């Protein structure tokens, strides 16, 4: 029914902002972005996206990509509004063709004046998901309008050979990702004590007592923080054993630094980068670390990396058998660091995201200490899980924003320094955290029916960067540079 439709014409606005009721983490500025491969999603009958076009121009129809197009139909209506606050429908129980994942064109008369175009959803005939790859409100007096977005036989054949080539580059982005979770790849530094350092590891280390107040720059990092009571997990592997190559604590307190992955910065902070690649500690585990795992032992290698023994501690809430066999009771960490980077590539629920700080005990987590920032979020978030009865029950706790990390201005930046501590006394766990010139955010956690009291379980705190993005490129990564590592336990009477 439009006769004066054009094969070409001028270029469509870009929309100044695009916005949404809600989504999955698939958000809308993936509506915007000339990309079949990527959406925006979300559940339920009437959520929206919104795309505002920054002063009012006049259209009359949209043009709009579906995800998994050429399988369900999707079902919506347009509205417009020229002040943002009250809304005009000038589609309305539109269906997508189920037939194409291309751009279709729904088009209406006469043209109206609107600065915001918003796609409100009623799900597919299949399912509740409003899913859409692209949207763009067009004027067909001045823009494109082809024939190629109503979808005929001709279209959906051209598609077929889009499609095809779309697969061919999946396999293609796929066998480019083969050594994901391989660790050979890094410079080899020296261990101390194979080359240096006649290490006594039927000794627990002396107890480093010099330490600076603040980092030192050309400093070890032995010299700047307490490393005897720590071995550090790298996710390379250059023993060929299939497993990250682990520091233990006499060569990390014996001044041991990787250049790439665990150094001493120009300012005396100590840099942890993790990529996405690596080798992994577990079959069970998808993402790699360059992280620090607590040895109360402090060297004696003796003494068994696991068991409620003397390299644990347990909650002071924990039976007295374990209260006496354990290196200590109850704990306290405090660290203070910035984030030089986080991932910028990878799914849209993973990217950026990672783990700065933890308590484990055999099997499951008191605490993940998380900070996420998004590529197009100003700055990030930072938040906690809580793990509890044996693993079956998990509760998010914000700090600073929450696991969408949709903080905008008011998050953490790249390059702030911030500080966290958690604090564990028998069955209460409190975190705070802590920013230059702002209030402290403190959680309280009861962990009275979390299970971690029973007896037999043993603990242990890590800190560094457990990456939480597989699907970002292989070469991706998260880096922090930390400024305090400061671990303190309480002893049994
Ligand atoms: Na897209």
């Given at each position: 029914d439009f006769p004066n439709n054009k094969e070409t014409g001028e270029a469509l606005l870009t929309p100044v902002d695009a916005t949404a009721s809600s989504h999955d983490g698939n958000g809308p500025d993936r509506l915007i972005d000339q990309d079949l491969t990527t959406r925006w999603?979300?559940?339920?009958?009437?959520?929206?996206?919104?795309?505002?076009?920054?002063?009012?121009?006049?259209?009359?129809?949209?043009?709009?990509?579906?995800?998994?197009?050429?399988?369900?139909?999707?079902?919506?209506?347009?509205?417009?509004?020229?002040?943002?606050?009250?809304?005009?429908?000038?589609?309305?129980?539109?269906?997508?063709?189920?037939?194409?994942?291309?751009?279709?064109?729904?088009?209406?008369?006469p043209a109206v004046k609107a600065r915001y175009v918003r796609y409100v959803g009623h799900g597919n005939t299949k399912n509740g998901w409003n899913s859409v790859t692209g949207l763009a409100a067009v004027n067909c007096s001045i823009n494109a309008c082809p024939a190629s977005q109503i979808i005929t036989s001709d279209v959906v054949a051209a598609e077929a050979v889009l499609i095809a080539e779309m697969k061919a580059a999946e396999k293609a982005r796929k066998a480019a990702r083969k050594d994901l979770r391989s660790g050979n790849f890094g410079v080899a530094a020296v261990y101390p004590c194979e080359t240096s350092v006649k290490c006594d590891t039927r000794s627990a280390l002396p107890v480093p007592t010099g330490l600076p107040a603040t980092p030192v720059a050309g400093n070890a990092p032995s010299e700047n923080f307490d490393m005897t009571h720590w071995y550090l997990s790298q996710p390379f592997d250059h023993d060929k054993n299939g497993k990250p190559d682990d520091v233990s604590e006499w060569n990390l307190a014996n001044?041991?630094?990787?250049?790439?992955?665990?150094?001493?910065?120009?300012?005396?902070?100590?840099?942890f980068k993790s990529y996405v690649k690596g080798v992994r500690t577990s079959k069970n585990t998808k993402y790699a670390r360059t992280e620090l795992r607590e040895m109360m032992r402090r060297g004696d290698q003796s003494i068994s990396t696991k068991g409620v023994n003397k390299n644990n501690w347990v909650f002071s809430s924990a039976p007295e058998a374990d209260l006496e066999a354990a290196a200590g009771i109850?704990?306290?960490?405090?660290?203070?660091?910035?984030?030089?980077?986080?991932?910028?590539?990878?799914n849209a629920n993973e990217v950026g995201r990672f783990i700065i700080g933890q308590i484990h005990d055999q099997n499951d987590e008191p605490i993940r200490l998380?900070?996420?920032?998004?590529?197009?979020?100003?700055?990030?978030?930072?938040?906690?899980?809580?793990?509890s009865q044996d693993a079956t029950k998990e509760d998010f706790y914000p700090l600073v924003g929450d696991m969408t990390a949709e903080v905008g201005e008011d998050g953490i930046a790249l390059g702030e320094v911030f500080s966290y501590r958690i604090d564990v006394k028998g069955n209460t766990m409190t975190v705070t955290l802590m920013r230059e010139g702002k209030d402290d955010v403190v959680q309280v956690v009861d962990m009275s029916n979390s299970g971690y009291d029973v007896?037999?379980?043993?603990?242990?705190?890590?800190?560094?960067?457990?990456?939480?993005?597989?699907?970002?490129?292989?070469?991706?990564?998260?880096?922090?540079?930390?400024?305090?590592?400061?671990?303190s336990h309480d002893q049994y009477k």
């Open positions: 999603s979300s559940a339920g009958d009437g959520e929206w996206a919104m795309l505002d076009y920054g002063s009012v121009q006049e259209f009359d129809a949209v043009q709009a990509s579906f995800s998994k197009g050429n399988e369900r139909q999707s079902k919506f209506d347009i509205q417009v509004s020229v002040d943002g606050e009250t809304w005009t429908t000038v589609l309305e129980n539109q269906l997508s063709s189920g037939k194409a994942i291309g751009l279709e064109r729904f088009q209406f008369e001044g041991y630094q990787h250049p790439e992955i665990f150094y001493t910065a120009d300012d005396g902070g100590l840099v109850d704990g306290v960490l405090e660290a203070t660091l910035k984030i030089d980077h986080a991932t910028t590539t990878g998380y900070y996420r920032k998004l590529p197009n979020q100003p700055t990030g978030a930072v938040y906690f899980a809580h793990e007896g037999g379980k043993y603990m242990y705190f890590k800190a560094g960067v457990y990456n939480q993005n597989i699907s970002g490129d292989l070469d991706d990564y998260s880096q922090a540079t930390f400024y305090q590592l400061d671990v």
